[PDB]
Design a protein around this ligand. Structure first.
Ligand SMILES: [K+]
Ligand SMILES: [K+]
Ligand SMILES: [Zn+2]
Length: 357
């Protein structure tokens, strides 16, 4: 039972040359890595090397146009970088951005490979820029390429095309990119918990609502758990995992679990407004470890309180290493809004999933 870990300082090169205090900071991965040292968790892990993703691998989820455009930004002057970045929804670009996105995906490919070949049982991927907002043909929300989505395809490419991989997205934002890429796919189960606020919360789309359950043969394999009007926390997420995520995931019976692990739902996050605790993320992690024979890859997405995400993700690694879950705070009754959300998803997925009725 050994846990993998991948981190590369080079992914800090991605930076905003106008707003040096833009929340998607280079130090995000630095602080998480550092926190692993202080808790002596790093030594307990097998260090998995990072690498560049190939354009061939990028093409698993992304158009030729999108790849070439981002590839070109590498040799651009700042005025053009400003220009190009402005064409997207919430995107800043530097000359090192393309390489960093490649390193994020490549790092997660090696981690998945290590898990699927049995070298490690599970792994954590401390990477940036994030990925779940990135679409097939466009960049969005600090994301250039959809790392978790690409990792699912790579995983299938080195085993079999029908390898059942589950993607659990507990980043506070909806992974619009990930949902769309697999919306017609029954081999990749996408489960997302996110702040919705009737579509007022980023990325401001109604695709994130519970009624969007997938298309074609992918009907029922897209699960949206939206939160409305309320500071959701550990009780609401534990309830959603108990009633929805885990029973659906068990029925799906994944062979690989990918976690789009953003920590912007964490308490203290400048953007999230939620209050999930580090203890909360640990229990979520531990819960997911009971699936796919423990084959779990935890991939960093969002999260912008340097202290919050450092503590939160370290707690997840501690769980993968086999340590015992810390006790949760005394569990408040669910916020009335949560029960509404949970029941709607229940109703919307009860036909496709036997364990829900
Ligand atoms: K999410
Ligand atoms: K799907
Ligand atoms: Zn986010």
């Amino acid at each position: 039972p050994i846990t993998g870990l991948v981190y590369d300082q080079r992914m800090m090169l991605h930076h905003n040359m106008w707003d040096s205090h833009h929340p998607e900071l280079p130090q995000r991965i630095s602080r998480i890595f550092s926190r692993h040292e202080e808790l002596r968790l790093l030594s307990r892990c097998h260090r998995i090397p990072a690498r560049l993703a190939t354009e061939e691998e990028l093409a698993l989820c992304h158009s030729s146009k999108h790849i070439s455009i981002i590839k070109s930004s590498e040799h651009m002057k700042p005025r053009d970088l400003n220009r190009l970045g402005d064409e997207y929804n919430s995107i800043f670009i530097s000359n090192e951005s393309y390489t960093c996105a490649l390193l994020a995906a490549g790092s997660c490919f090696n981690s998945a490979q290590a898990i699927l070949t049995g070298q490690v049982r599970n792994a954590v991927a401390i990477v940036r820029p994030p990925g779940h907002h990135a679409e097939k043909d466009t960049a969005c929300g600090f994301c250039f390429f959809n790392t978790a989505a690409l990792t699912a395809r790579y995983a299938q490419s080195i085993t079999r095309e029908s390898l059942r991989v589950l993607i659990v997205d507990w980043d506070v934002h909806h992974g619009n990119g990930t949902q769309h890429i697999f919306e017609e796919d029954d081999s990749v189960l996408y489960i997302s918990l996110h702040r919705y606020e009737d579509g007022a919360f980023f990325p401001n789309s109604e695709d994130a609502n519970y009624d969007k359950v997938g298309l074609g043969k992918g009907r029922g394999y897209n699960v949206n758990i939206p939160w409305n009007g309320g500071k959701m926390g550990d009780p609401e997420y534990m309830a959603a995992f108990h009633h929805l995520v885990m029973p659906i995931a068990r029925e799906f019976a994944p062979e690989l679990v990918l976690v789009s692990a953003g920590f912007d739902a964490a308490r203290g996050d400048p953007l999230g407004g939620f209050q999930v605790t580090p203890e909360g993320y640990a229990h979520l992690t531990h819960q997911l470890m009971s699936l796919a024979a423990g084959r779990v890859l935890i991939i960093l997405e969002g999260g912008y309180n340097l202290t919050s995400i450092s503590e939160s993700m370290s707690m997840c690694t501690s769980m993968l290493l086999g340590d015992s879950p810390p006790s949760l705070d005394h569990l408040t009754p669910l916020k009335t809004s949560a029960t509404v959300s949970i029941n709607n998803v229940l109703r919307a997925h009860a036909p496709f999933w036997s364990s829900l009725r």
